[PDB]
Amino acid sequence: SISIGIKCSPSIDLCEGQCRIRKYFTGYCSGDTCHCSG
């Protein structure tokens, strides 16, 4: 994965949307930072 440096929480993980508008396929919150892949 890459990290995009958007803050997140795993409990309400909105990283997929942040990754998809940046043209990745998916994303997830690690610790408190969004990761993207694809």
From Swiss-Prot:
UniProt entry keywords in alphabetical sequence: Disulfide bond, Neurotoxin, Secreted, Signal, Toxin
| One example GO MF annotation | toxin activity
Tissue localization of expression is: Expressed by the venom gland.
Cellular component terms per the entry's GO annotation = extracellular region
Keyword Ligase assigned: no
Q: Where in the cell is it found?
A: Secreted
Keyword Secreted belongs to the record: yes
Q: Which cysteines are joined by disulfide bonds?
A: C8-C29, C15-C34, C19-C36
**What does this protein's UniProt record list under function?**
Neurotoxin. Decreases the action potential of myelinated nerves in mice and frogs.
State the protein's name: Venom protein 51.1
- Organism whose genome encodes this protein: Lychas mucronatus (Chinese swimming scorpion)
